[PDB]
Design a protein around this ligand. Sequence first.
Ligand SMILES: CNS(=O)(=O)c1ccccc1Cl
Ligand SMILES: [Zn+2]
Length: 140
Amino acid sequence: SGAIYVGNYRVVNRHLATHNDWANLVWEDSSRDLLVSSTTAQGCDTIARCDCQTGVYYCSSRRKHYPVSFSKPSLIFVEASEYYPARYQSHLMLAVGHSEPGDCGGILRCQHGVVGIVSTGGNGLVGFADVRDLLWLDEE
Ligand SMILES: CNS(=O)(=O)c1ccccc1Cl
Ligand SMILES: [Zn+2]
């Protein structure tokens, strides 16, 4: 679990979105495993605007933050998980590291702020859904 709180926006994994998220929907994309809903309170997070390939992510299943190198956002084949079939996921970044299903929502950050959230794992990789292209998160 986990979300990004930027302005009056909540960014979650689409597969973990609540009824309240869907009832307050701003934007969702299944191919990216992202959903954004409206908030009443303003949030503490800053979105990275950058092409960093190094940063740090939170892994709830280790209670640890790990420094990683990660690929640039790409269209990647993902094997079946408890929450999705085998399918192609867009805007996905991969690193070498530990990720189980409950680790989804964990933040990946770089020197510029929040890069994305854990979305995939298995086979010694963790995949992160990028949010750095979502410029509209920073306004309105
Ligand atoms: C797998 N998706 S993707 O290649 O990251 C991508 C798709 C559409 C627009 C921009 C990008 Cl980066
Ligand atoms: Zn950066």
